[PDB]
């Protein structure tokens, strides 16, 4: 099996530098051309850099948007592809994929893609979330919907579970919305009315960037 | 640079239908045009290379054609596992460029939303803010309108909405809508309402609470 495994992504301030790696296996590494391609938060795919294979000429290629800032290189003995990025920009923020090209005359396409590593470039401050319970109005069915509001955090991601994973069906975690440089998301869970409030329902929120975990038990309002 | 224009941007189809996705190049690119499918939470996957060449492991229902500037990806009898984003990409000249993608979404029977409204938490109020949250869950089709009302009067400012991706189990959509006010404004009014309009009902679904309850 062709394996391409990227690493190195992280949160960097603008003007900073970061090196990505892609470890490959399952094919004769040195013969193939390899590229980096990124996917922006808008889901656009953008080619970032290419290094040609051994019978292709070995040269490097870059779009104007990264020329002078990024350097692609390879260590064939290690089966590893590198991307050294410098002078980073907020517009560089993306999931970065390593990709392997094909063979022969009909082989300039991307044939295989990695799993991606995430780069976020921002001058906004890392900010932990506030976690607020969503319980129905005191005056409000066989099923009850509860939730948690996770407000004012940066950067993405946060993860939300319910009762440490024992409530899995009936959960919706909504995509975060950005405003004034902070994210807010919500999560809903729907359970039988006989299970709440007689049994506890807790949202477990994790924000790794700020080393934060919050457990918020949802209690009925007065 | 070669600009690739993909049409349509989004398309909903019932499994078993057939589709034709268009990719048009701003200048001629011979047959140097490739197609990828990216499913949710996954990396892109090569479907067709050099306009029409098949890829081992890809089902025969995928077919490509075209040369010059106008290219087509046919999917004949779309299967559940085929829904996702379809990108084209050219290798005729540097820089390598991609189309913006066609999102193929699954058409199913209509489903009305389950609507729930939630008051600000006392925790949030201690911080000077007040968010009122409305969940509109498991509906189809995706088009829906939410109107917020305070004491029965429409409010447009301070609303933020978020839609989920199409559900992997039941192919419905869900939306969350949050109205954020100051605590002092929140406490100057009585009732808060979210009104959902959806093609499944002539009348909107109304959910409210008030602060005298």
């Amino acid at each position: 099996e062709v394996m391409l495994v990227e690493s190195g992504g992280g949160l960097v301030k603008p003007g900073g530098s970061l090196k990505l790696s892609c470890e490959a296996s399952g094919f004769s590494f040195g013969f193939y051309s390899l590229s980096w391609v990124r996917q922006t938060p808008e889901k656009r795919l953008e080619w970032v850099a290419t290094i040609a294979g051994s019978g292709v000429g070995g040269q490097t290629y870059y779009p104007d948007s990264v020329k002078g800032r990024f350097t692609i290189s390879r260590d064939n003995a290690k089966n590893t592809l590198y991307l050294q990025m410098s002078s980073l920009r907020s517009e560089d923020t993306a999931v970065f994929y390593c990709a392997r090209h094909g063979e022969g005359k009909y082989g300039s396409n991307f044939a295989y893609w990695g799993q991606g590593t995430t780069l976020t470039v921002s001058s906004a401050s890392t900010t932990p979330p506030s976690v607020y319970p969503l319980a129905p109005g005191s005056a409000a069915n066989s099923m009850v919907t509860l939730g948690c509001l996770v407000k004012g955090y940066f950067p993405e991601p946060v993860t939300v579970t319910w009762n440490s994973g024992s409530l899995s069906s009936g959960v919706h975690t909504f995509p975060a919305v950005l405003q004034s440089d902070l994210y807010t998301l919500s999560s809903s869970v729907t359970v039988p009315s006989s299970t709440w409030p007689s049994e506890t329902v807790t949202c477990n929120v994790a924000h790794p960037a700020s080393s934060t975990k919050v457990d918020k038990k949802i209690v009925p309002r007065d | 640079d070669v600009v690739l224009t993909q049409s349509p941007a989004t398309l909903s189809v019932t499994p078993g239908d057939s589709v034709s996705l268009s990719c048009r190049a701003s200048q001629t690119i011979s047959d140097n045009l490739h197609w990828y499918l990216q499913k949710s939470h996954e990396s892109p996957r090569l479907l067709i290379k050099y306009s029409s060449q098949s890829i081992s492991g890809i089902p025969s229902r995928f077919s490509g054609s075209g040369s010059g500037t106008d290219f087509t990806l046919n999917i004949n009898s779309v299967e559940t596992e085929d829904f996702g984003m379809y990108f084209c990409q050219q290798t005729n000249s540097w820089p390598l460029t991609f189309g913006a993608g066609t999102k193929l979404e699954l058409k199913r029977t209509d489903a009305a939303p389950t609507v729930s409204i939630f008051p600000p938490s006392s925790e949030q109020l201690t911080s000077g803010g007040a968010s009122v949250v409305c969940f509109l869950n498991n509906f189809y089709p995706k088009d829906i309108n939410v109107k917020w009302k305070i004491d029965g009067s429409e409010r447009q400012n301070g609303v933020l909405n978020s839609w989920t991706d199409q559900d992997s189990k039941d192919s419905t959509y869900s939306m969350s809508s949050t109205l954020t006010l100051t605590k002092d404004e929140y406490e100057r009014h009585n009732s808060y309402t979210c009104e959902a309009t959806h093609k499944t009902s002539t009348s909107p679904i109304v959910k409210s609470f008030n602060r005298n309850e």
Partner: peptide, 8 residues
Amino acid sequence: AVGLGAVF
């Protein structure tokens, strides 16, 4: 046409 295909 950019000619990136592997040759052996």
